[PDB]
Point group: D2
């Protein structure tokens, strides 16, 4: 019905876009490009790089953002988390293995590993496997089986002949990994980078229960040395990356400021045909809870070595948007891909196209019905704004906010109209970069409602978002309908 | 569902009540009683009485209203319109007739009629009938047949032996009555009573098309001599009383300020079984258009000579409310009945009871869906107010209004909450006495919104309409949600 | 919507009509007339008449039915039940009373009563009241108050001056009446009239719980002497006539073959404004249960002394049909009214008119959704027949049935199409005369499906119910769609 | 809701699967394997191979089908259509090109091409391009630009350095290709293979309008020499592969027996972001019309060189099923992939899993509402069967059919129950291998309905599709509900 009206034709994008910043796009020029193509949030994967690499990247993001005064860019720190990685190889050159050979794996991490004895970051490895256990390297590339266990090593038997590099992933199927969700390095990165440099999001890797989220809350509340004793309003985004997280989803979602659905280990703990079911379900639950949800399964793989993607990758992003996703995330397409700019631009257009397939009145009633009544005043105002915008055929919903909460609530009810959030706090604007359909205007002051609305309508007119004679809904416990001069 | 919740039990009335004031309830004491039983509007039927009778009644109504300052009483003038009535009988005593006898009817209205020659107010009577024409008197009591036509009289043959009195109704089936909808007397009554004494409603008898309505509009605009050159805002309520009125209903409804469904001639022009179908349709169309509708078919006939009505009469009122009727009107039950006070009280309780059978969310969506979009700003505001009242579970919807238009728009969407209209103009309050579920607060000034709302909430608290901590929606292009202090 | 399409116009009646047979219409000629006007079922009120009067009436009904071979007439016995009546008056002439006088009431039933000492049928009267209790005669006409209680009498004080006749009703507010629901006379009438003469319905007066229904079931099962040891399939219709019945409705409805909502005492035990609520609720519950429901509050009172009714009475029948009533019943309009034929004809046309206001697809989905799944095979076939008829725009639903059960199930789902029930058993056809929209064809044999359908389509074509080329749904666990030759 | 019930758990597949048969799976043993993994239809892509290659494959398919008598395998011929392919390379070895060099292209198809002068099958190539025209080879691999046009050749300038092989695809963007939709070779393949060997489907490449479909109809009706003068019932499945096909879709869809959504040229004529929008619309229109639709964009690309696919590829299949797709098609994954058997098995499990996300009652009402009424008799029967299956909670819908039309109609309404089609004609069974949720029982005779149903139920019991006491709907204009013995 709505999809067919689009075919007869064969309004800016609402779904936010997160880009992972790596070597391929670390410089100012590239970052500006990424903003122009549609980047809402820049992500720093703390599984990679060092302190100096991260800090430079951060400076570059902010410099690039300064070059784009009509844009707001949020910055996300994605924790390393409880991962197991291999060590450095022979001098620095990659190594292949053949089935049948006996490969040794030492826990002496600071050791150069050859074709016979590689290294491992997990010092509790010997006490975590048994004779016969399977050890997976590079996410199902080097499959092995334990033959011996020593004090600080294991000896495995290479089962299938494959090629792997350095710092590769490692997996222990059916084995409990004795690592914390927030280890010592994660704490250091949270306090001494995210809080210290005033970042906007913490993507918490491998969250498994509400207690993981609460530990992060506690860390934030006990570390205010970088903000004059004032607790950061930095947002916790929990990454569901395994079966435990899926089982405890409700608790995690309820505790967090947002959810990210990511590849992780999930594809090894459940049947692969079931992954899409879990994703769809987690997205719907986030929609009902009004918590932002990020879809991030590295959707455009083919765009690390190709100018444009294949159908399957585009339909994945389209269907993620249609499932109700707030943001989509690019991983190695931008971080270390050959065509970082092409991917974002493609992804952006796909999102916009998928959003034309939405039956907005129907979507609104679905969400409105799913929310138990009575609600708080702010949420009621939000609903009425969306209903009003529909009833007068308004082009914009403008919200004057000091925290972004009303803007998040309007976003929850999925208006067809673009939401313009007006605030005096730049941090609030960056925080809103994960909320669907929210554009932000940062102001010097927010005290004079009339003036704020006037400037917002003038600026929106300049940006081709509204025209003279068009209606806009203004919200600030209060709702009004104004006409664009 | 909603009706069955009520059966297990075996919130003030929203439907407004119109009482016809006559001899039985003309005095101050009686009118005070009628207010206490639930009278919203006092109707003066200008088919009966003289100037002095009407003027005394008008004073009594207004004196009674002063004795009840928390109430607001509207005053309606019901026009004589194009009717044919007989003259005075033998001295002043009633006369019966027997079939077979030849009854004469003269057009000399100033004459005492006997059992052989009666009188008639319609001077064009001879030129309107032919030999064999049927002449009905007292709405199907004296059925006669024309035998001779003279210059200023007709001679008929009494077909059925019945008893009749003075000033009785007269009908000419299948004959065109050459009388205007608004004649000399009607103009006189509108200008020198309704406008002159500042009444609130003109109930316009036998409206047949839009042109009839527009003639009344013209009279109103051309007669501002009693209001300092400012046109009155007196409401035109067109009475649908015949087949023509039904045929042209849409035009009439669109031109009018409201609609009254009355008995009139309709039952003689269409099959009686079709009347309730016409009524249901007319009520639905009024609901959709947002125009007040009055149901008035003399619902409680039995209560002119009995303490209480029978089932059929109560169900009639109940179903009128459930059909969507804004007001119910009592006729001979209050005017010249033996039990006026019992009637009103009964009708009030039935209305309240029928209102407990309503599924309010379902009703809201039915009306909201029937309204073509986009709507104008105030209608959108009204909708949003009703939805917000629901979503926070508010007790009141308060509207600050200078005309009553917003209160009418809110009323259209049928909220479960009582609607409180705050105005500075007492005429606006009186005009709203035909909008369902609206109560009116008259204030000295309406300028300071915060103050207006504070005093409205305090007065509502005093009247036990709201309690501390309860929510109320306040509307004045603008909508907000406040908590009662 | 559907009501307005009808107004633009300003298909046979579905709602069945029950007529009470009394002195005014006891003869063959009158009964034939009643059939022609629309009588489905003839009712014998066993509160009145004697054995000889009842038997003659029965013969007349059956003779009249023989004169109408294309009609099926059901016969209903309405039990006297636990009622209290007054005795015979002075010789035989009616008597009036004045407030203040002390009226005596003896329990010596076989005694002529004057203006000072009347008689009473209830011998336990003295042991049922106390000093100060109120005794009501003729349903709130003679209001009295006990002054003395003797062995076989009471002395009351006339409170209000009114006029009453013989055999008048009597009521004891707030007092327990020690009479059985099925007394000795009721049992006699059930066994020696209803079963003996093979009647179709027993309207059981003043049912108060399921045990009352079960007593009647037991009586039927223990009295097969008039039907060769084969238990009668006579249908029990329980009359809800008081508060107890309303409280225990679910149990009563679940036990019975049908429900009648009647005047009884209800109007004295609950507030009168609540009666319509209870009726609406009981009708809906019967619709959901698929049990036939009869509305019978003496809807056309004014038609005992008038040619035509008033609006309130017509709208009552219209709204009863719209509430979901299967049958409407006339009481004193036919039994002892001046215009028995006029009333039925009016009532019939009203029903037909009200049925045009029904949104059939909407009504179907409402009932279909209210019924818990899974259902039995016969009910599933019934639903599919109704859906099929809609989908092909069929004109008839024909059902071959030996018990009428499938015809009752189709009726439950309220098709717009007339339901034609084909059976070889005349008793089955009469039983179906209380099911909405069911017309019956009685056949010699029912074995050849093809032939039965052919004859039914031919007969229906002759009766102007279907035309050549039109579709009909044929049902007999099996459903087919045939075309009318 | 339905997706989340599946997450808590973390019924056979209904969606049909088309496998393309090539070198990797040509032998009997492989084809048996493909049947066991879930192949419904075997596709022969006549763009590759010769007569003997196709004929051997046809025999192997048919021998493999005999080894699985409980399965039914359909056979599809996919036409070469209007395509442009290069010739053979240097002896037989592939050749790479570097940008800047001038590549020649001759129209002499019978020639061995080097790194300087390649060959081409399109003889009108010189008269189709101009100076500056872009010539694409291997679907955007070798981008060239015309420098010279000769009588039977063109000289181009290699724009981008890429590697290509033999028989590669060739495109002329913005140039009209003067080739018929059904040429000499296509006619030959349709008549002397599809019709001659009695295949079940013609997948018609690059259908652009209704006229193309009607030409294929004409060929079929004019060629009955291999079926004794009886026109084949071979299904025309039009492939939408370009913008023209999309523009004229309605006409094509109405003329065709089914629709295939293929990759084709579409991605070169419209923005890539718009492809999924077109696909969703085309699937919806097919669902509404009741025509089978095949989704086939080479969904599992990664499984030509990998054991299992990535997320995007699985979600693509999952969402195709949820969009309403009747069949999914595998291309190079089975034809010449390294892991054919793993691919099919994965795609099958995804389909089944996606099918558990369906709200079956909701889906039924959506389709039922979209169908304009009235429908024809068999469509009404199909609807009623689906509703009855639901209402009694049946396990199977069994249809006795001579053409398969009723089975297709039932399929259209998407019952949760498996549909069992009973036919005497093996071609009918094979034709139904593209209808979702239909399984087929081939019988010697179909005459005795009772017997047919008995044997169908017994065979279904044997296959564990139904148990004793379970209900099944039987359809053969007629519908009934039976219990499995």
């Amino acid at each position: 019905k709505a999809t067919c009206l689009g075919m007869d034709k064969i309004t800016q994008r609402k779904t936010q876009i997160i880009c992972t910043i790596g070597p391929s796009c670390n410089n100012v020029e590239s970052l500006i490009g990424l903003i122009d193509k549609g980047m809402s949030v820049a992500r720093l994967n703390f599984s990679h790089g060092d302190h100096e690499s991260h800090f430079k990247t951060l400076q570059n993001i902010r410099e690039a953002a300064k070059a784009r005064p009509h844009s707001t860019v949020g910055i996300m720190l994605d924790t390393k988390g409880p991962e197991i990685r291999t060590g450095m190889l022979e001098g620095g050159k990659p190594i292949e293995l053949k089935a049948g050979q006996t490969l040794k794996i030492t826990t002496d991490y600071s050791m150069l590993g050859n074709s016979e004895c590689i290294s491992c970051s997990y010092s509790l490895l010997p006490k975590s496997v048994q004779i016969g256990s399977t050890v997976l390297i590079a996410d199902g590339s080097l499959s092995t089986q334990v033959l011996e266990i020593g004090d600080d090593f294991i000896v495995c038997k290479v089962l299938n002949s494959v090629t792997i590099g350095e710092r590769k992933n490692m997996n222990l199927p059916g084995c409990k990994v004795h690592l914390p969700i927030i280890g010592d390095k994660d704490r250091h990165d949270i306090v001494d980078f995210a809080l210290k440099y005033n970042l906007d999001f913490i993507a918490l890797s491998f969250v498994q229960n509400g207690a993981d989220v609460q530990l992060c809350r506690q860390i934030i509340s006990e570390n205010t040395q970088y903000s004059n004793g004032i607790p950061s309003s930095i947002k916790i985004i929990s990454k569901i990356e395994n079966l435990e997280g899926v089982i405890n989803f409700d608790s995690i979602c309820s505790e967090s400021d947002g959810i990210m659905v990511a590849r992780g280990d999930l594809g090894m703990e459940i049947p692969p045909e079931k992954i899409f079911v879990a994703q769809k379900c987690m997205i719907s639950k986030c929609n009902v809870a009004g918590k932002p949800v990020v879809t991030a399964t590295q959707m455009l793989e083919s765009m690390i070595k190709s100018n444009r993607p294949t159908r399957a990758e585009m339909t994945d992003v389209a269907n993620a948007v249609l499932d109700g996703s707030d943001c989509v995330m690019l991983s190695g397409e931008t971080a270390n891909g050959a065509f970082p700019f092409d991917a974002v631009n493609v992804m952006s257009r796909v999102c916009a196209q998928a959003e034309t397939c939405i039956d907005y009145p129907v979507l609104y009633h679905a969400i409105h019905s799913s929310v138990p009544k009575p609600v708080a005043v702010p949420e009621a105002i939000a609903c009425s704004a969306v209903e009003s915008a529909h009833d007068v055929n308004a082009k914009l919903i403008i919200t004057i906010t000091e925290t972004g909460n009303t803007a998040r609530l309007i976003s929850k009810y999925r208006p067809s109209q673009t939401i313009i959030a007006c605030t005096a706090k730049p941090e609030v604007a960056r925080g809103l970069k994960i909320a669907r359909g929210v554009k932000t205007y940062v102001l010097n002051s927010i005290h004079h409602s009339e003036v704020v609305i006037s400037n917002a309508l003038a600026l929106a007119k300049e940006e081709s978002l509204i025209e003279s004679g068009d209606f806009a809904i203004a919200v600030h416990n209060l709702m009004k309908i104004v006409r664009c001069p």
